[PDB]
Design a protein around this ligand. Sequence first.
Ligand SMILES: N[C@@H](Cc1ccc([N+](=O)[O-])cc1)C(=O)N[C@@H](CCC(=O)O)C(=O)O
Ligand SMILES: N[C@@H](Cc1ccc([N+](=O)[O-])cc1)C(=O)N[C@@H](CCC(=O)O)C(=O)O
Length: 198
Amino acid sequence: PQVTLWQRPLVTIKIGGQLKEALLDTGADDTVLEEMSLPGRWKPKMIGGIGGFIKVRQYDQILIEICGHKAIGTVLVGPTPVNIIGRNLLTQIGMTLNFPQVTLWQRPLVTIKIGGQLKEALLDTGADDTVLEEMSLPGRWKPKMIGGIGGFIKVRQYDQILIEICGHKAIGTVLVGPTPVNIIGRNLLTQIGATLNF
Ligand SMILES: N[C@@H](Cc1ccc([N+](=O)[O-])cc1)C(=O)N[C@@H](CCC(=O)O)C(=O)O
Ligand SMILES: N[C@@H](Cc1ccc([N+](=O)[O-])cc1)C(=O)N[C@@H](CCC(=O)O)C(=O)O
């Protein structure tokens, strides 16, 4: 299946005998699921995201059926606001990003030019919005708060911002704030015709 990003890329998964919905998230290294019942041993672990950090339980060798496709790997269980299927499992179902074709064995980083500056950013299908590290942008902005896996952060919202993503031009909203990594979200990914394929 190929999938566009005009809507969040949700898939049905089966894990631990239970059926759940999860977001295919190219910006996540790991798979993180809402608190749920899984059998077996686990190790305490700490992961980060926008907002800060959360403690999770790490289960290994977990079988998961993602949109019918089987994969086995590490699954983290904790207080995430949404169930996320990260690259550790996306590579097993042969997921690719298309806009060039991009595989997910490494983080999908691209070079962007915005506000006259060159930066690197992560193509993130799990992000509704585009969020960049503090930087100098011209013009008016509006205060806004956004959430992520570890809580929330305050950002500055700039609209009608031109960005060149891997050579492709797009114009849209860009949030600027304390994100640990520059993220290109669906609002811009749709403009460069990015598709998720597996
Ligand atoms: N949506 C991503 C945004 C993100 C990517 C990479 C970093 N980092 O290297 O520091 C921070 C934020 C996200 O929240 N990714 C998390 C998801 C949880 C996980 O995979 O463990 C991440 O840790 O990659
Ligand atoms: N990597 C994603 C994980 C995520 C997706 C959706 C929600 N949610 O609807 O509540 C929470 C976590 C991520 O960090 N998404 C953030 C990125 C920042 C942004 O786009 O505003 C999100 O808010 O979607």
